[PDB]
């Protein structure tokens, strides 16, 4: 069975992993190799079978789990494209809802104006038609008395004359559409901004936090620093002891939020958000790395952003001292933007931080020192 | 016929404008009055009739014309409300057209991404299904050779072993949707602005006007000041002789217009509009009351508005020196606004005049002095 020495295969060559005849093995191709008897070779190779079997089983289970992961990835591609479509739909429907509402309201007002013009004009019209037929009647009553016997002419001519005269002097006495010009596009665009914001987050001045000088009122939505001297504050690690400030009890942790506060003519204040990880006791250092994101006003008109530096950044003083501040907070984009919100229609950006906030934050209102009575105005949540 | 003296009426009392008897007139109620005979009274009163008749005719014609004016005013109320509605429709359709187009384009891109994911994933999936069935075939081919007569086991076991081994090591190798976050509203809003503008007015550098140093190129839409020394200009009262400037041949007279000019890195220039009523010869004083509405750049980075004062107003230097200026002109609102237009998506306002321009204006481009070679860059109409 050697096929070359005609003598069957009985020796296994281990360096060539093939069978051989006794001669190839004695003095032939395989004379110097490592060889052993065939029975021992098969009994040595058979022992490797459990491990080859299990390496195959394990490889197949790996690939099966990968197949499972890919099959899941397909439906997650489906769902992701679905949510993308739906999110575009919803963010654009905000704008389309606004335009639709605006157009309908403009149209209602148009119809109102035009109908009122119609009735006013038609009234003056029918009252001239009456006056004009009175004139007609005068004219040919005058021609009735124009040619009649002498004495009856004398008996009524000058009553007719007087009547004519001052029904001539009884003569009758004599729109408001907001017609639109080129900057209307631009006014609608500027008004759309305020609507792009989320519904006003309805927060609450949290008396569990307020500095002992402050009082909350109007259902926890107005904070006022008091005429009177206050007791010292206890060591509750999140009541304010030195900085006269107060937080909302609502903790903001995800998504996007918008809120407005009415400052009016208050000469000094600060507004923004404080991290939950930083404590509120002792003197505070108003820079981001302390968990403080603050916009401030001092001396009635000087507006300072409290960004990570030594000095705060002076800002462009607006036309008027801002009477209401709007605050937009996006965690997804790490953004705290401050807006002049005195115009209830159009928002004007003051400043914005671009920092991914570490974790959850509280809206903080520094209703700053009463300073011997000159800063007694309140903070009002709009 | 007196009804009190029984004796007929024959005398007319002129101060009481009534008839009387001879007795009332002789010694009675009317004894001291002014009286005349009845025949003369009727012959005196009859003469006033033509003028009373014509005063009536003229009063009636006046009221008739007023009736005509009111009747016209009604249909003009109709047409005014119609045009108001249609103008709101059209200015808002601008915005709605934009949003619709944007949503469709986002959707097309979504489908593209998802289909390509589908094919890539399904390819890797069917190629693992093939690899896994190969593993199956390996496994029970291995079990076919696991238990067979000695020598044929030895004759093929280790070819099977090698095959298994490196088809095990032949193992297989291992989306891009622009998924949208909260500031997408805001990006779409900022991109809408550029679309609120009217179609680019397609102007032409008018060589009939250019200062003798300049050359127009690219179909009258690029002006460059030349290396070379120029001839003096003739006394055509609207060619520029001292200020090296050039106008569009298009005269703007009504409505609203928008155009963009590419300045790039040009260190010094001015752009804006010049009145047709002011002449372009000699040295020019760049303030409004001379018919010049100009924004300027000097020393590469300093941006000055040329408003009616002694000094020009310095402006906020943008992040980068602006590479393209956009100009919006509304006569209806008396407005010339300048925009940073380097971002082909979002426009940023530099400055705007708020003055009702007297009459028609030309777009003027001060392609300022070549200044011995350092300001040789061109002005390009976008
Ligand atoms: Zn042999
Ligand atoms: Zn050998
Ligand atoms: Zn009498
Ligand atoms: Zn009398």
Residue numbers in the entry:
A (entry chain A), B (entry chain A): 85 to 258, 263 to 470
The article reads:
Tripartite motif-containing protein (TRIM)72 (mitsugumin 53; MG53) has been determined to rapidly nucleate vesicles at the site of membrane damage, but the underlying molecular mechanisms remain poorly understood. Here we present the structure of Mus musculus TRIM72, a complete model of a TRIM E3 ubiquitin ligase. TRIM72 is a member of the class IV TRIM proteins, which is the largest subtype among the 11 groups of TRIM proteins. Its domain organization includes an RBCC domain followed by a PRY motif associated with a SPRY domain identified in splA kinase and ryanodine receptors (PRYSPRY) domain.
After introducing point mutations and deletions, we were finally able to resolve molecular models of mouse TRIM72, including RING-deleted (ΔRING, 2.75 Å; the highest resolution is in parentheses), full-length (FL, 4.6 Å) and wild-type (WT, 7.1 Å) TRIM72. The overall structure of the TRIM72 dimer has an elongated shape. The coiled-coil domains (CCDs) form the main scaffold of an antiparallel dimer with a length of approximately 17 nm. In the middle of the CCDs, the structural core consists of the hendecad repeated region of the H1:H1′ helices (prime indicates the second protomer of the dimer) and the H3:H3′ helices followed by a pair of PRYSPRY domains. One side of the H3:H3′ helices is wrapped in a four-helical bundle with the hendecad H1:H1′ helices, and the other side contacts the β-sheet of PRYSPRY through hydrophobic interfaces, hydrogen bonding and ionic interactions. PRYSPRY comprises two antiparallel β-sheets: one sheet (β3, β5–β8 and β12) forms a concave surface, and the other sheet (β1, β2, β4, β9–β11 and β13) forms a convex surface. First, several arginines (R356, R368, R369, R371 and R386) and lysines (K317, K330, K389, K398, K460 and K462) are situated on the concave surface, consisting of variable loops (VLs), and contribute to its positive charge. Second, each PRYSPRY domain displays a concave surface that is positively charged toward the same side, facing opposite the CCDs. Recent cryo-electron microscopy (EM) analysis of TRIM72 and the crystal structure of TRIM72 ΔRING also revealed that the CCD ends are dynamic.
